[PDB]
Amino acid sequence: LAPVAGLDVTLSDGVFSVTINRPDSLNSLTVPVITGIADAMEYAATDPEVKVVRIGGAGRGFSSGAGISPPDEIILEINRLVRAIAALPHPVVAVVQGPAAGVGVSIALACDVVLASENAFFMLAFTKIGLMPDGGASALVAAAVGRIRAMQMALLPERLPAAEALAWGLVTAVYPADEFEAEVDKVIARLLSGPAVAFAKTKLAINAATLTELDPALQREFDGQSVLLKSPDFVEGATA
């Protein structure tokens, strides 16, 4: 597997771990990073040494989203990345220690388990800069919290705090910020000692029932974002 700058990928004791490490950019994502994540997830599905996956961010925040600083390519890699999380025949754990915004939220909600810090908030930032949701957020969000709440995060984006995310059913768990790394470790270890084949078949089955709209949604997002990206309102969006 090829190494990628701003991204640490390690496999230890069946825990495939993928950490985005651009702590100066608040873990914003660039095409070659999105691409390495996609590659790693696709890789993880093929390696019989993998039992549990974990994706997270170093520093203060999980990810600020796609780097706001050819255009269709970013959308295609983001889509290829989400498909790969959703297909992966193991438990995927998103470790959300700080803020997650735009695509960061989508990546996390493509995952199977979402572990939040009291610190963390979530924001579907896209309309703030003249874009629409990406990475399947058109389905992934509503698949967890329902329609009205999805519509709300997307048209009236706001820093949704962890405690509220959990009460909406958007995250699996919230730990106090001083206990977070320890509680996350206990979750990974419980999963690591679980029935690997039953976990695989359970994750795939819930996803086949709850994500029948993922692919259609990725097709629309590609169609829609691709116009919005090459459009005037977004040039203004990125300026401010």
Distances (CA, A) of 152 to 24, 215, 225: 30, 22, 19
The 10 Å Cβ neighbour count of residue 219 is 11
- Nearest distance from residue 69's CB to a copy of itself, in Å? 19
**Residue keyed to tokens 């009205």:** 148
Distance CA 182, CA 74 (A): 35
Q: Which of 87, 185, 233, 235 binds a copy of itself (CB under 8 A)?
A: 233
Q: Which of 7, 9, 114, 125 binds a copy of itself (CB under 8 A)?
A: 114
- Nearest distance from residue 142's CB to a copy of itself, in Å? 5
- The partner residues of 11 in beta bridges, in order of sequence, read 16
Q: Confirm or reject binding of residue 100 to a copy of itself (CB under 8 A).
A: no
Distance CA 64, CA 213 (A): 26
- Please report how many Cα atoms fall inside a 13 Å half-sphere around the Cα of residue 76, on the Cβ side: 5
Q: Confirm or reject binding of residue 127 to a copy of itself (CB under 8 A).
A: yes
Q: Which stretch binds a copy of itself (CB under 8 A): 15-23, 75-83, 98-106, 152-160?
A: 152-160
- Nearest distance from residue 182's CB to a copy of itself, in Å? 16
Q: Which stretch binds a copy of itself (CB under 8 A): 18-26, 62-70, 74-82, 110-118?
A: 110-118
Q: Confirm or reject binding of residue 142 to a copy of itself (CB under 8 A).
A: yes
